[PDB]
Ligand SMILES: N[C@@H](Cc1c[nH]c[nH+]1)C(=O)O
Ligand SMILES: N[C@@H](Cc1c[nH]c[nH+]1)C(=O)O
């Protein structure tokens with residue numbers, strides 16, 4: 001009987017049609033990274049499990065696709081890339097010249113719904129100032145504009161965790177509870193306030209402390225945060241600098257302040273941001289932030305400032321489909337070379353060689369078939385031109401060329 | 416203390432330097448596939464284990480990186496791509512238009528030495544005739560020529576399993592032993608004749624039968640095979656057609672007949688081939704062949720002719736390094752925008768925007784630093800041009816431009 005034609009649970013196949021859609025997306029990721037001066041890197045999908053043991057109750061680490069090798073070693077299919085980046089960065093030490101701007105498009109994994117997705121990662125390493133976050137946010141807007149979206153379709157919500165850090169510290173809560181608190185508060189929009197309030201109670205935070213978090217999360221503007229913490233709290237000056245810089249780059253209509261944005265990851269220390277559709281129909285398009293302590297927690301002797309984001313391949317595609325910005329673009333090829341019959345095949349191969357030699361994409365009809373079915377084939381594969389190689393033209397040093405989107409042409413004139 | 420900076424056992428990191436080498440290779444794979452009219456596809460690295468249970472004692476299936484999920488399902492990190500391709504092909508059925516020419520560059524996995532490698536796969540589906548093998552072999556030569564190699568450096572050895580099939584059948588050996596026999600005979604060059612002879616004895620093949628295999632493997636030319644099986648054995652006409660066609664395409668100096676080539680995979684039915692360095696220093700550069708029965712064994716109601724090859728990312732790189740064809744090509748960027756000081760940053764961002772708007776790759780100096788260190792940075796990141804944004808030029812609607820591989824220029828003139 002049949003073998004199982006469906007892919008493994010939660011995983012996608014990319015036959016040519018779907019692959020073209022993915023490549024359209026990835027081409028933008030690559031093109032944007034190049035426009036912004038980022039350098040590509042990669043690392044193994046298989047990493048040590050201990051790389052992701054952060055103990056803050058993170059969704060990303062709770063849903064880890066992990067297993068034990070035959071030699072008893074605890075590994076996982078990476079749930080995200082940032083730990084791999086830091087590993088690479090630590091490996092280089094003082095040999096890594098800074099600042100560094102590194103990007104990748106890893107497939108990342110989870111176990112629970114989809115179990116895999118691709119995630120464009122962009123990170124700036126060695127830059128203390130908000131200029132890093134500005135560039136990253138502009139890179140994300142650029143990718144989206146490149147895909148056909150506008151500031152009418154999407155935006156980027158931006159906040160700083162430092163604001164909340166103050167409230168946590170000032171309430172007497174030891175800072176080891178800060179990350180788990182961000183993690184729980186990250187669920188605030190999704191699940192009820194009672195549930196989030198309940199989760200914070202379990203961590204030992206008192207009712208007063210919880211209340212102070214709620215209020216600051218609901219503050220609707222930077223001037224309101226300034227009233228609460230001061231116009232020269234670390235966060236106020238950074239955010240103002242950030243908006244001033246994004247404005248200057250011409251993307252002011254894409255970004256805004258939102259005090260409810262914290263992200264679900266333990267390691268963010270400063271500015272955080274996430275992309276969203278302005279119709280409120282989809283989950284976050286991308287998300288990122290500054291994580292200045294991570295390399296220190298991995299054992300770096302010297303603190304390494306870092307900031308970056310991930311930008312998934314799934315939500316963006318749903319948005320683009322909704323907006324009618326992913327028309328099927330069929331496969332194309334420049335030339336299809338058609339032997340008049342099998343006796344002409346050697347000659348048609350010589351023609352095939354010349355066409356490809358000149359940088360053209362070209363097929364030759366591989367089967368034995370009638371000239372008209374060859375033309376049908378040429379049309380199906382999206383050929384710009386059909387080149388018929390028939391005995392009578394060949395003797396004259398020519399072929400029959402026909403534009404598809406039949407005049408005899410000398411061989412040398414083909415290209 | 417430190418986290419483990421080394422990657423998981425047998426797996427490679429690709430920091431920007433190494434990633435550039437890989438991208439140089441992959442660009443050729445992609446460029447060649449496009450020149451030859453192949454369409455990209457992909458599938459999950461995680462496949463069902465049962466997809467690879469072929470029971471012929473294959474190295475590829477013996478060294479399978481497999482595990483059991485938490486839900487008891489037997490899966491594996493794919494040891495090769497061809498089973499995934501067939502799965503995809505079967506899923507499509509009559510909706511798949513033929514012939515089809517599909518390619519991918521999957522990371523493939525093994526457990527035992529390296530445990531991962533990338534493998535360019537190229538396959539032609541729905542083509543009975545040797546024209547498929549011709550195109551595939553030419554594609555492999557093309558990729559190698561594109562990388563800087565010549566027919567002096569490398570070649571492609573070519574054979575047909577049909578020859579050996581006859582000897583196996585004519586000796587009374589039931590055809591269910593044919594694949595395991597190819598598998599054992601594949602080891603002939605590597606391990607001693609005694610060991611290969613011994614492995615064939617264990618399968619129940621008699622001394623006479625073994626002898627007949629040895630002789631045919633050592634036959635040095637097609638005329639010698641013709642003497643043995645006939646000038647119109649299936650194999651003779653196919654091979655002659657194959658060499659005639661590769662000759663006509665202009666790659667005759669790249670290919671040759673070798674009766675010892677069988678490949679290690681169970682499913683090859685016809686022509687098989689493998690690339691090699693002409694100094695005898697390296698293992699096979701690539702390998703492939705026709706596998707007309709595979710889709711039938713997976714349950715296809717109608718036989719689907721297929722042929723293809725895999726071309727690894729490791730051996731080719733060692734060869735290219737030996738031949739001095741992988742010089743380090745440093746990272747480049749067109750422009751580096753340098754704010755004279757922080758007050759000029761908003762203006763420098765506007766300049767940054769314009770440059771990128773025009774399709775240029777551009778950095779802006781993200782840190783606070785002196786103009787000369789900014790220039791050093793520009794040189795380190797391989798900038799073609801440094802664009803200094805200073806207050807006095809700005810008032811005149813200009814910036815200072817300096818070619819690195821300082822004249823005031825109007826903004827509009829930059830691009
Ligand atoms: N790893 C984060 C994104 C990120 C990259 N760099 C910094 N943050 C995520 O998966 O959401
Ligand atoms: N899967 C084969 C190569 C191949 C692709 N298509 C046909 N053969 C290998 O790994 O060697």
Ligand SMILES: Nc1cccc2cnccc12
Pocket residue numbers: 079080108109110114115116117
């Ligand atoms: N959020 C996510 C993390 C890791 C892997 C994923 C796979 N599919 C969807 C979402 C994922």
Ligand SMILES: Nc1cccc2cnccc12
Pocket residue numbers: 494495523524525529530531532
């Ligand atoms: N031959 C091979 C098959 C599957 C995975 C591999 C990883 N590294 C080297 C060789 C491999």
